Write a protein that binds this DNA or RNA. Sequence first.
RNA 1: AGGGCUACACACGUGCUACAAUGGCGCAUACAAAGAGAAGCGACCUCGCGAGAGCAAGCGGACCUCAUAAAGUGCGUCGUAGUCCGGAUUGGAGUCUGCAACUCGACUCCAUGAAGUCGGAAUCGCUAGUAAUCGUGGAUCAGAAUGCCACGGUGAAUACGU
Lengths: 178, 70, 100, 117, 91
Amino acid sequence: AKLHDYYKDEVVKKLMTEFNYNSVMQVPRVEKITLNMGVGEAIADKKLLDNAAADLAAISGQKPLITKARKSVAGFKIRQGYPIGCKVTLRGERMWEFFERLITIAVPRIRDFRGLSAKSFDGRGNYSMGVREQIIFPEIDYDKVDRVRGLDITITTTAKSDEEGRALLAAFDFPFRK
Amino acid sequence: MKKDIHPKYEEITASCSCGNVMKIRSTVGHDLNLDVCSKCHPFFTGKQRDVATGGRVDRFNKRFNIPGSK
Amino acid sequence: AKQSMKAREVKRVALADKYFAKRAELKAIISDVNASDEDRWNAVLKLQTLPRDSSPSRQRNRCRQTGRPHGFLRKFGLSRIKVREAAMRGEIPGLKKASW
Amino acid sequence: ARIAGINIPDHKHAVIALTSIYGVGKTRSKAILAAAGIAEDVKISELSEGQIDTLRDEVAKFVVEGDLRREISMSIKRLMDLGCYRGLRHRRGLPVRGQRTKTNARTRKGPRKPIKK
Amino acid sequence: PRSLKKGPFIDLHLLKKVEKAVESGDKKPLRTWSRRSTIFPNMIGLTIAVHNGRQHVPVFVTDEMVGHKLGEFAPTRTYRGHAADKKAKKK
RNA sequence: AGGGCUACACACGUGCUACAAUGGCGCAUACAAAGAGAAGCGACCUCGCGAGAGCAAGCGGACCUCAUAAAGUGCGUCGUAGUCCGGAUUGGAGUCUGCAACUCGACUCCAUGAAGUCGGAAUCGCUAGUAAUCGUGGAUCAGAAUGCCACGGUGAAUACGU
């Protein structure tokens, strides 16, 4: 895609100056973004699974496998086991395509949002962006009329702190918390 | 990458440098500081008194009384 | 019967004259269409609280003879039962049995 | 000849015939006919498709039903989300313009329910 | 259909209470029974405790509610749910 | 001062208006009676999209107004599909009486648009200006009429038999 040859050329030097790091590589990048869309239920019915597939398709076209829980003893609702999430991982060129549409067209889609606490970053500076709804990039038959199906946008990083996690999408101007 | 299953790239890979020329790149107030009502709050915006057409006649500064005239 | 409906009838006439006389056309002059780009000022229409009891909207009167509630007739100062009672003994002028 | 199809009534006089394209009651349809060079009293079957075109362009300015009914959905929802008495009466379906509750409840409030006597 | 016709309203009754309350930013619930009266710019960030015929309900004023009456937020009537009528006597 | 009977879950009573085409729709077209109008209505007036509006001479009602009486009349149009009947709901604007019009107020109007295809049990008035059906006015009356009360349009089956 266009994005990453440009993030290399522009943002990696910005970050390199701004943090006074000792290597060009000490600066964070975006590593594969897995998603969830932890939808739940529809164990025989798969209609609410079909509506979750047509929402994921907008952003990343690959087939939902629909993951099931491996032991079934947890605190979630059990009835015949349960299916929950999808993945529909953004990876490589697909990920590089995604990271330019996020902020620029995905927030203008969103009108009601409760995510993006600054305290919640942990570990790697890994995060999952609770957008409350489908962030629809242009698609055929996304529309079948439904509700809810906001998704975890589960970002992963070669960033190894919380602030180096928060330095993704910073050459996009978004109002992130301190 | 599972290449084939991916939908088209027409405005996706294109212009990762784009303006606010027709629509914003990030929105203000979508994180809800107040709940959105989809109403405009009238009499804060707009008038406590309506447009004045119909019955437009030069004003009389002295009292008149409907049973009081004969 | 009640003294409250007689007390009302007496209270309205000094207060009709006191609040209302200055206020007569004042609803039309300061508020309605006659206020086309003239008046329309809250500070001259906050004054219609005073005429509230003295209003055309509270001249429901009921009987003058008895003070008796409900079913009133302005043309007698009476009600159904009490008209008929005065009419039986011929106390009302012009009143006769109807036939046609 | 049908303005747009699906529901236009075939061979009806022209003022009544357009009350199935929506955004166009009797009044709006009277101005549309006069404007297009249509007499009120021809039946719609008398028109060639190029008269339908001329007529239709004057139909097309007005509000479409899909937008009409979204405004009225969002109007009732805007009040219902505030909890003003307007909004409170919408929730249940009960009258907002002062109408009775006391009888003839089947079209709004649904099937008969037990009442001890 | 109904309106508020043509005149300008601020309520005389809300004016003295508001005038002293706005100077403080905010103060103790203003005891109002005058629920026929509409909400206005002057009243924003105050708390009007609204007689409903039985008792006062505190109504918080804020910019989205100036299009409304005090009596609109404050209830009157009771709606009786409809699962079953009360049948029986109690001993 | 604010709330309430007219609440609402339904059942039950009554009347209106309807389910049709005897009609509705468009464009043109007609004649009333009787009365009411000093909280009231009101010429002329200017404003208004019809209605209306505010102003005001004025009124005593065979003068002026409510009032544009409606059904009915003319031509073309429509066939049981909730329609070409019925228009409730509801969104919005223009107008009104009043501190105040949200639940419990009025008038006009634009758009879309549900119940109802003459109702089992139930259920009444009627012998002829009657029953039926249409409009109008009035007592009450700030602002509310489907009610009630009187008036005028068009106006029926049969009364063998007990």
